[PDB]
Amino acid sequence: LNPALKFRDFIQVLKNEGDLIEIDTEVDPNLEVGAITRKAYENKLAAPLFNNLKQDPENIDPKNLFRILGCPGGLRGFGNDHARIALHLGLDSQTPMKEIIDFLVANRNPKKYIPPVLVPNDQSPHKKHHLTKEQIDLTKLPVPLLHHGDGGKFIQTYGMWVLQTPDKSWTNWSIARGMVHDSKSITGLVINPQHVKQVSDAWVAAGKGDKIPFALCFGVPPAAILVSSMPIPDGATEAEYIGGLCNQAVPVVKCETNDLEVPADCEMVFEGYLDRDTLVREGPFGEMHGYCFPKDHHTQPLYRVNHISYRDQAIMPISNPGLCTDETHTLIGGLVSAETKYLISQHPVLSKIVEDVFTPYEAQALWLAVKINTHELVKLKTNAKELSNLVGDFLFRSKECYKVCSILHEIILVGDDIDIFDFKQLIWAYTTRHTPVQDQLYFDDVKPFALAPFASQGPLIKTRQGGKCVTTCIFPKQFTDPDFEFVTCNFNGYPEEVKNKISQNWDKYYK
Amino acid sequence: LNPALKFRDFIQVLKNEGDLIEIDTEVDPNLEVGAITRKAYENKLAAPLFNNLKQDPENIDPKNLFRILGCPGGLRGFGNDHARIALHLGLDSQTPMKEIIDFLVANRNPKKYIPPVLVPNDQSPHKKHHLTKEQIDLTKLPVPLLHHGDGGKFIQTYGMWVLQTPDKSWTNWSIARGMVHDSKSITGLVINPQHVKQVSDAWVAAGKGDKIPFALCFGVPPAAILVSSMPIPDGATEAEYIGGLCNQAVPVVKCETNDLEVPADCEMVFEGYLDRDTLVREGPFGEMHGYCFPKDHHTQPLYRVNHISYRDQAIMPISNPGLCTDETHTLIGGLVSAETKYLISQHPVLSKIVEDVFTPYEAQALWLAVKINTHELVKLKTNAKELSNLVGDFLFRSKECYKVCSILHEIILVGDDIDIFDFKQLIWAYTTRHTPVQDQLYFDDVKPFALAPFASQGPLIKTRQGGKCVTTCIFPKQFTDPDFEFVTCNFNGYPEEVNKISQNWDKYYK
Ligand SMILES: Cc1cc2c3c(c1C)C(C)(C)CC=[N+]3c1c([nH]c(=O)[nH]c1=O)N2C[C@H](O)[C@H](O)[C@H](O)COP(=O)(O)O
Ligand SMILES: Cc1cc2c3c(c1C)C(C)(C)CC=[N+]3c1c([nH]c(=O)[nH]c1=O)N2C[C@H](O)[C@H](O)[C@H](O)COP(=O)(O)O
Ligand SMILES: [K+]
Ligand SMILES: [K+]
Ligand SMILES: [Mn+2]
Ligand SMILES: [Mn+2]
């Protein structure tokens, strides 16, 4: 019935659509879960539900803890390849991505928001079973080693961190990676300018950065995990946008051991204290640009888990990032795209000319294509450098987009003949419409994205400055002549009369 | 059957392989031939042999002049997508392009060459029929208007110009586009630094520039039209190289109205005089980067046609350039890669490290990917900006490559984990391994390629300086640490042992 609000309805729709395979054969958390999911992503196969994982004998409740759903946001192979993404928002599964983005943009006006509603503990399935700190041992759960060279088992790849500011004015829901540190403990990334850091920075500012309450929620409402992955504004409570998107309040319940509220329908909730006063090793991970660099090591804060609540037969969703295409593309890039569309929308100049933006997956969410209406472009009476200075100041440096676009390294301005969602069209335009280096405006005083390989393995990690450009793929005269024409030399570029005769009668030609 | 030496054998082997579609229904040379060929390239369909072109009723011999063969160098839909390129050289049709290129490169040694052999006219099928000047009217032949906004009907898109230097030391076979100017005339591109220009320049040097003898041959031996598209060196005679590649001399015959030699197995030979001091309108054309710019306009020199020889039921092969992939990618791009690879083969530094080079068609032949052996790279005790200057200087400024590599505007240095022939792999490495701008080395004094749309519709068309860069997609430590380690996060990047999944896949999904 409602896959936006209920993880298990999400699973049931995929099963109904023929886009889910239950695997009853024993699969090993050590490396095979990741191989399978990867082969699923890459060939656009059905999402695998792993019912029979190889279990450690000391696991405290193996019949319940846990199965793995993989590829929850991976592309589908038969119809609309973005079905799984549409489904997270409870939309028609054939809703294509450009429209999925319009739906999110459409619902970004705060007047559409609906705050979550508290309900009693017996309306939540995950409140059926409990583990205290003493009983908890994360070492024994079937947490996968997703990639060779991963510095730990990454238990948190598709659940949601719930952190609240000390004054209670902002409750943030987001995704960030997490690996098992020891029996009772998870460490993961907590970096500028991510909200998990902003919010915890507040607890630090008040001298309580050792005992920051957190919940970590697995199998949350699919619309909730989608937004958990979207960079909505600083200070914004994700729950309220999720509500609008669902035209319905997210039902939530209070934790057992802190006063955070978590969704009624989760598979498993982990409760504890984020400890920003103790650093620990958090291991390299195979991430969104397609590498694991096994010798890359750094220290990160520690989440001390004191409690766990979980339902019968818990299912954990999982993301196993690498080459395109996967959740670190469809969700990290798609949702950057959606928020940047919204924000641009509200820009008095950029809203007149920008038709659409999208992060082509082929570029691992390092590029943002920006589709410009040339007719309205002429009216502005501008040029390549000045439009590029405006765009990049806005996307790289504004208080609006400083964080939102932080992962992006190249912005690609193109005219409105190119469906930016079709990479054959984007790559044609990129190689044929910009002079190497000359039509790339370099911004040196911007914060680079530390995960970009070219930065992590280069000098940009030491310097922490620059690395970005805005590339204009719009011919000089497209800025001045509104009747500028070229014929695009493919079949679809022929005159309508010709295409129609040839297409209608193709069987007469190619018999 | 010899598809290297005989066009009709080439056609027969595609037929035999299921990669040919005889079209007997009437197709119009006005836009339709072009629209059908565009759909066939783009969907990698069988090559279309149009048996029934809509004829002007005044054509002097419509049963013979002419049929059209489309997509001769297009990609095939079923096995080795490059099978047509292989058969041009007479190779097994499943020969992959890397291996096609190795073959061309292996045979670049002048030792291996074999000059052509003169045979009597009664050995040439195209000597069966003849047209004198008074009889010729190019405007009644079913020449196609290939793209909307083309300035004229482009008759020459897969034929071979033959021009010989006054001193008869150098004879060049090449492709350059040519449209019909009038009932007796073709105008075509003759621009720097192409050999059509270098060789005709010589006549203008000698003051005899208005009467340069030429032949223009169609349906020439597929190995010859293939080399006709390869930038072999200045002053090198293509016939010799082609013979080497065919392990047989190309049978040639003498033109009727001049002393030029033309392949004996052609469909139609045109003969006449290239007039370098009569410049006429040579209207825009749908070109290799995907665009026809309808109000781009220049003038070009004139080929006056005085004689046509042809054979029963002449076939004209054609190329209808545009979006990837078509002959302006597999041939223009592939052979620039091939000649580049060989020339790099003779460089005392670059041959230690370069495994392959390729123009990915997705980049419309503006990009050259250069695959570098990492272990041998370390031994060079070098870094990004030094290697970039070296590589960029050689391809853009050396007497060896100034012309060869003229079409390329971005050279991309990648390590040897990247199969540079699989664009999925190349674009991964491009986007993720170079910092924009910091890792691009601009060259501002080199000659830009004037066809490139960012040039043609930009200042580079005027300034004729710059427009190019070398882009490093090799991590700094790849140059110093030989054991530099990273895991590729696709399926093929997991340990060989984790076979288990592949061999047992049906147990998971079944
Ligand atoms: C969907 C998704 C997004 C990842 C991501 C992953 C997924 C599956 C993983 C789990 C596979 C592994 C790593 N990723 C992290 C991440 N953000 C971050 O700070 N650290 C991360 O380690 N994100 C990006 C992050 O979720 C977005 O930037 C959100 O905007 C964060 O929320 P916020 O805007 O509330 O800070
Ligand atoms: C296969 C091929 C190659 C084209 C070509 C085409 C095809 C089908 C067309 C017919 C689609 C249209 C235009 N092209 C021209 C061209 N070179 C050139 O100088 N002017 C051209 O108009 N070439 C490239 C040219 O043939 C190569 O650069 C050769 O190296 C030139 O021979 P040369 O080295 O002896 O000068
Ligand atoms: K978020
Ligand atoms: K040539
Ligand atoms: Mn947030
Ligand atoms: Mn030549």
Side-chain angles (χ1 to χ4, degrees), chain A residues 1-14 16-110 112-133 135-280 282-294 296-444 448-460 463 465-503 505-511, chain B residues 1-110 112-167 169-207 209-210 212-380 382-384 386-496 498-502 504-505 508-509:
Chain A
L1 246 176
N2 194 12
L5 248 6
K6 308 254 249 204
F7 177 58
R8 297 226 172 167
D9 287 6
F10 175 68
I11 290 170
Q12 194 47 79
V13 172
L14 294 177
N16 298 338
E17 275 180 8
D19 192 35
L20 190 79
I21 289 308
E22 314 214 17
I23 302 170
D24 300 354
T25 311
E26 190 188 280
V27 176
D28 192 357
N30 187 22
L31 292 178
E32 306 183 357
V33 167
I36 294 152
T37 52
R38 268 291 130 187
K39 187 155 194 191
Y41 286 124
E42 290 161 14
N43 307 274
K44 300 186 193 183
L45 304 175
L49 186 48
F50 293 91
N51 299 150
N52 188 4
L53 279 177
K54 180 173 168 257
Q55 285 278 35
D56 182 288
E58 278 147 73
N59 175 354
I60 204 168
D61 190 6
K63 86 207 227 270
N64 289 145
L65 290 170
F66 39 78
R67 285 125 83 199
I68 293 169
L69 178 59
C71 300
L75 298 178
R76 167 173 286 196
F78 37 112
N80 170 40
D81 61 358
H82 279 65
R84 295 186 206 154
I85 310 301
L87 285 169
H88 276 70
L89 294 158
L91 302 168
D92 181 308
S93 52
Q94 308 311 292
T95 306
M97 181 57 151
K98 177 265 203 298
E99 299 184 76
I100 296 160
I101 296 173
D102 301 331
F103 182 73
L104 297 155
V105 166
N107 283 268
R108 272 285 280 103
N109 189 344
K112 290 266 183 55
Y113 302 174
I114 288 162
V117 65
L118 182 57
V119 313
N121 286 14
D122 63 51
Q123 293 192 43
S124 169
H126 69 77
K127 289 311 198 169
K128 180 189 206 169
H129 302 103
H130 291 84
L131 289 164
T132 65
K133 184 179 183 161
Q135 311 177 241
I136 290 150
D137 190 333
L138 299 175
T139 294
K140 308 302 181 212
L141 300 177
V143 176
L145 188 89
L146 289 172
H147 325 75
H148 191 59
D150 277 1
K153 302 166 173 211
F154 275 89
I155 193 176
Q156 153 54 353
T157 69
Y158 208 82
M160 178 177 85
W161 297 102
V162 179
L163 266 28
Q164 186 180 84
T165 54
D167 69 12
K168 305 184 171 162
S169 71
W170 170 20
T171 295
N172 197 86
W173 292 4
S174 65
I175 299 177
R177 77 182 188 211
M179 49 160 275
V180 180
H181 170 73
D182 66 43
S183 270
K184 322 275 187 161
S185 244
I186 299 170
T187 180
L189 278 178
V190 172
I191 67 175
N192 283 319
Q194 299 295 79
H195 290 344
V196 288
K197 176 134 192 316
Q198 281 186 235
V199 182
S200 55
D201 271 351
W203 285 81
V204 174
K208 292 157 179 168
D210 70 315
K211 267 141 105 90
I212 313 148
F214 88 87
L216 168 62
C217 306
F218 301 100
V220 309
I225 202 74
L226 193 146
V227 178
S228 285
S229 184
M230 179 159 191
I232 66 158
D234 294 7
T237 292
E238 282 80 14
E240 305 186 344
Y241 182 54
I242 296 148
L245 285 160
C246 309
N247 195 54
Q248 181 176 332
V250 185
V252 303
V253 297
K254 194 194 137 294
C255 289
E256 294 306 310
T257 68
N258 56 71
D259 299 333
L260 301 168
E261 287 171 344
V262 298
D265 299 282
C266 300
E267 300 281 305
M268 292 172 284
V269 176
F270 280 22
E271 307 177 6
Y273 287 116
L274 165 57
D275 189 338
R276 201 120 107 61
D277 286 11
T278 114
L279 298 183
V280 307
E282 98 80 55
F285 187 56
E287 255 268 29
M288 64 183 290
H289 302 115
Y291 310 82
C292 177
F293 282 103
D296 284 8
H297 282 87
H298 64 26
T299 57
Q300 290 295 140
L302 188 58
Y303 296 82
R304 309 185 175 278
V305 178
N306 302 152
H307 196 78
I308 292 173
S309 69
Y310 63 94
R311 72 187 309 167
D312 284 337
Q313 304 207 299
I315 303 156
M316 189 154 77
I318 276 298
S319 174
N320 183 24
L323 272 98
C324 65
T325 136
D326 72 70
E327 298 72 32
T328 58
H329 315 306
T330 54
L331 290 185
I332 292 181
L335 302 177
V336 159
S337 298
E339 184 76 346
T340 309
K341 220 292 209 49
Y342 180 72
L343 287 182
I344 277 183
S345 181
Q346 294 292 116
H347 199 275
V349 174
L350 262 27
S351 61
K352 296 191 228 138
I353 60 179
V354 172
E355 275 178 40
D356 265 336
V357 316
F358 179 61
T359 47
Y361 305 140
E362 285 78 2
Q364 314 287 148
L366 287 154
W367 284 13
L368 182 68
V370 171
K371 182 175 180 187
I372 303 310
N373 185 302
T374 55
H375 282 275
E376 295 294 320
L377 183 55
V378 181
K379 294 173 198 187
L380 290 184
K381 272 163 259 158
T382 198
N383 68 27
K385 287 283 190 290
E386 281 138 59
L387 178 58
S388 301
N389 202 326
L390 194 62
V391 165
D393 275 350
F394 185 59
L395 295 185
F396 299 146
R397 299 196 187 226
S398 74
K399 67 155 148 51
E400 285 76 18
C401 308
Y402 84 99
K403 163 169 178 298
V404 162
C405 300
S406 63
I407 81 203
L408 294 170
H409 272 69
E410 181 147 5
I411 311 297
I412 292 181
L413 304 173
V414 64
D416 62 81
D417 60 307
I418 300 303
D419 170 7
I420 60 178
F421 293 85
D422 171 9
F423 187 72
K424 292 180 70 183
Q425 297 181 56
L426 187 65
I427 194 50
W428 173 52
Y430 173 92
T431 56
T432 61
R433 309 194 185 174
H434 95 267
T435 299
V437 187
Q438 289 296 312
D439 298 347
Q440 306 177 252
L441 182 66
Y442 183 77
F443 293 71
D444 188 76
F449 184 33
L451 278 64
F454 49 72
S456 69
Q457 305 317 103
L460 286 187
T463 56
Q465 230 150 44
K468 307 186 165 201
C469 96
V470 169
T471 306
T472 133
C473 298
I474 312 180
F475 297 122
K477 279 196 195 311
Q478 280 184 296
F479 284 93
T480 59
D481 181 356
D483 300 293
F484 183 70
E485 70 207 3
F486 51 90
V487 167
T488 131
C489 297
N490 51 16
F491 175 77
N492 280 331
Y494 277 91
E496 234 54 34
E497 247 208 298
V498 171
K499 297 186 289 188
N500 297 356
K501 189 190 183 202
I502 294 294
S503 277
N505 289 74
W506 193 251
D507 289 344
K508 207 174 112 197
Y509 302 114
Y510 269 65
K511 57 177 82 169
Chain B
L1 284 186
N2 200 345
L5 283 171
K6 299 219 254 199
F7 181 64
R8 303 232 167 167
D9 291 355
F10 174 71
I11 290 170
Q12 182 66 49
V13 171
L14 300 177
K15 198 182 177 69
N16 296 345
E17 287 180 355
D19 205 9
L20 195 95
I21 287 280
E22 304 219 21
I23 300 182
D24 287 311
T25 180
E26 176 185 297
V27 174
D28 193 336
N30 187 51
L31 302 178
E32 306 194 342
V33 160
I36 295 157
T37 48
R38 280 322 307 191
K39 186 161 177 195
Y41 288 128
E42 292 160 22
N43 294 280
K44 306 150 147 221
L45 305 176
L49 181 63
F50 301 89
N51 284 148
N52 189 7
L53 295 172
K54 166 175 199 302
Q55 292 279 16
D56 184 302
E58 282 158 42
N59 180 340
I60 199 138
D61 189 5
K63 298 198 295 248
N64 299 320
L65 298 171
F66 39 73
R67 292 175 302 145
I68 289 180
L69 176 71
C71 306
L75 301 179
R76 161 181 301 191
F78 45 99
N80 170 47
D81 56 342
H82 281 75
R84 316 201 188 140
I85 311 315
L87 301 152
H88 272 74
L89 291 170
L91 296 177
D92 186 91
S93 66
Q94 302 325 114
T95 311
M97 184 66 172
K98 184 267 199 301
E99 308 186 17
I100 296 174
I101 289 171
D102 285 340
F103 178 82
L104 286 155
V105 149
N107 274 282
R108 264 291 271 107
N109 192 343
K112 287 261 184 26
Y113 291 9
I114 311 181
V117 65
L118 187 70
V119 305
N121 293 5
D122 65 40
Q123 307 268 37
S124 178
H126 71 84
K127 294 302 196 172
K128 168 164 197 182
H129 298 119
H130 284 95
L131 298 172
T132 65
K133 194 180 183 186
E134 137 72 19
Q135 296 170 286
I136 286 161
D137 188 333
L138 305 177
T139 65
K140 306 303 185 212
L141 295 182
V143 173
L145 169 94
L146 285 172
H147 325 74
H148 188 77
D150 280 7
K153 295 175 173 171
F154 275 82
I155 200 165
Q156 155 54 344
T157 65
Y158 210 69
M160 176 174 104
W161 298 110
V162 173
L163 296 163
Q164 158 173 101
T165 44
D167 58 15
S169 53
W170 177 13
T171 305
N172 200 241
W173 292 1
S174 72
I175 309 179
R177 79 184 186 212
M179 39 169 259
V180 178
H181 175 58
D182 70 28
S183 76
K184 315 271 186 192
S185 274
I186 292 174
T187 183
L189 270 178
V190 177
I191 76 159
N192 287 306
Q194 298 293 85
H195 288 158
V196 57
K197 190 141 182 317
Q198 277 181 33
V199 163
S200 66
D201 270 344
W203 252 267
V204 171
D210 62 303
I212 318 168
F214 84 83
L216 171 70
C217 320
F218 301 104
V220 304
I225 206 69
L226 181 145
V227 167
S228 288
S229 328
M230 178 160 181
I232 70 170
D234 307 333
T237 299
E238 278 84 358
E240 287 178 36
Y241 178 41
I242 295 152
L245 294 155
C246 304
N247 191 22
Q248 187 162 323
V250 170
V252 287
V253 290
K254 179 204 162 303
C255 291
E256 284 300 323
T257 59
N258 63 54
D259 293 349
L260 297 179
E261 304 182 310
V262 293
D265 296 291
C266 298
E267 299 282 313
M268 296 167 278
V269 186
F270 290 26
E271 307 173 7
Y273 299 104
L274 165 47
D275 194 343
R276 234 283 232 359
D277 62 69
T278 311
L279 290 172
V280 301
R281 182 181 130 279
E282 110 73 56
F285 188 49
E287 195 51 71
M288 64 176 295
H289 305 112
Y291 301 89
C292 179
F293 289 108
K295 37 195 45 177
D296 281 18
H297 64 69
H298 53 36
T299 198
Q300 292 288 113
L302 196 80
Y303 294 91
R304 303 185 182 286
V305 183
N306 298 307
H307 195 256
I308 290 179
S309 73
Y310 67 90
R311 78 191 285 163
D312 283 344
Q313 305 185 318
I315 299 162
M316 186 151 86
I318 267 285
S319 168
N320 188 14
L323 271 110
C324 67
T325 297
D326 73 53
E327 292 81 9
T328 68
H329 317 304
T330 49
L331 295 187
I332 292 187
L335 307 167
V336 157
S337 311
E339 173 78 331
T340 292
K341 210 273 187 93
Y342 171 70
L343 292 174
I344 272 169
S345 177
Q346 300 300 99
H347 203 289
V349 180
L350 297 177
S351 62
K352 295 204 222 137
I353 63 173
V354 172
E355 288 184 14
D356 286 309
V357 314
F358 184 58
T359 51
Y361 311 142
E362 286 88 344
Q364 297 295 137
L366 290 144
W367 284 15
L368 196 80
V370 162
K371 184 182 185 179
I372 297 308
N373 188 277
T374 41
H375 293 264
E376 297 295 324
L377 172 63
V378 167
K379 293 171 193 185
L380 277 190
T382 203
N383 59 59
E386 262 173 34
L387 184 44
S388 299
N389 237 105
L390 184 63
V391 182
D393 172 78
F394 177 56
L395 313 178
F396 300 149
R397 305 207 263 236
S398 88
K399 61 152 149 64
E400 292 81 26
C401 299
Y402 76 109
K403 166 161 163 310
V404 173
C405 292
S406 59
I407 62 167
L408 304 158
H409 277 73
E410 181 156 354
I411 317 297
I412 299 163
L413 307 185
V414 65
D416 58 54
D417 72 313
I418 288 279
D419 181 1
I420 61 150
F421 298 92
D422 173 4
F423 189 74
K424 272 208 257 170
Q425 284 181 247
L426 180 60
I427 193 67
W428 173 47
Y430 184 82
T431 48
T432 61
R433 301 195 196 168
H434 86 88
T435 301
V437 196
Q438 286 198 291
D439 300 326
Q440 304 178 251
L441 180 68
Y442 196 61
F443 285 80
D444 57 55
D445 39 28
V446 299
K447 285 253 151 49
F449 187 35
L451 256 54
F454 52 86
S456 64
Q457 312 306 288
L460 264 29
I461 195 101
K462 282 178 204 285
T463 79
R464 299 203 263 283
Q465 296 274 75
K468 303 197 178 172
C469 77
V470 171
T471 305
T472 301
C473 301
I474 303 162
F475 298 116
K477 280 189 203 325
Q478 285 194 286
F479 284 85
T480 75
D481 190 344
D483 306 295
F484 184 72
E485 229 218 308
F486 61 82
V487 178
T488 305
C489 300
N490 54 19
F491 170 85
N492 289 331
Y494 278 79
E496 281 295 334
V498 172
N499 299 304
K500 194 165 185 286
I501 295 293
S502 278
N504 297 76
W505 186 255
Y508 297 132
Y509 288 76

